[PDB]
Design a protein around this ligand. Structure first.
Ligand code: NAG
Ligand code: NAG
Ligand code: NAG
Lengths: 49, 50
């Protein structure tokens, strides 16, 4: 309800508490180069070389 | 893959426990297949009636 001589002033107030969730980190992982590809095989490790 | 390593903690792999024994386990069959009897037959077959 806009007017050029009218204003609205709040009388009361409410105190509200909100929640915000933010990821910070993820799991750390390691991979074995040889045991994933040529697991326990001298021939396959030689080929992978 | 370097002759010098810096300070820190490094993930190693394959701590070189290389096997040194080889074993074989086979069933108890001992008689030999009759390849000589199969190959020694007087007549084998016709190709259309193999
Ligand atoms: C704007 O204010 C004037 C007085 O200065 C008034 O006459 C006019 O009606 C007002 N405009 C509206 C849309 O009410
Ligand atoms: C503001 O709201 C509270 C909660 O309803 C009420 O107790 C209080 O009287 C209100 N204040 C005014 C000035 O209206
Ligand atoms: C076929 O069998 C007979 C008797 O068992 C033997 O005398 C002959 O030498 C055999 N043939 C061949 C090619 O071994």
């Amino acid at each position: 309800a806009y007017s050029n001589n009218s204003i609205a002033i709040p009388t009361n107030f409410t105190i509200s508490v909100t929640t915000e969730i933010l990821p910070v980190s993820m799991t750390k992982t390691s991979v074995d180069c040889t045991m994933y590809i040529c697991g326990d095989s001298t021939e396959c490790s030689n080929l992978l070389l | 893959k370097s002759f010098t390593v810096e300070k820190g903690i490094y993930q190693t792999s394959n701590f070189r426990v290389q096997p040194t024994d080889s074993i074989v386990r086979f069933p108890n069959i001992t008689n030999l297949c009759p390849f000589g009897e199969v190959f020694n037959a007087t007549t084998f077959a016709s190709v259309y009636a193999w």
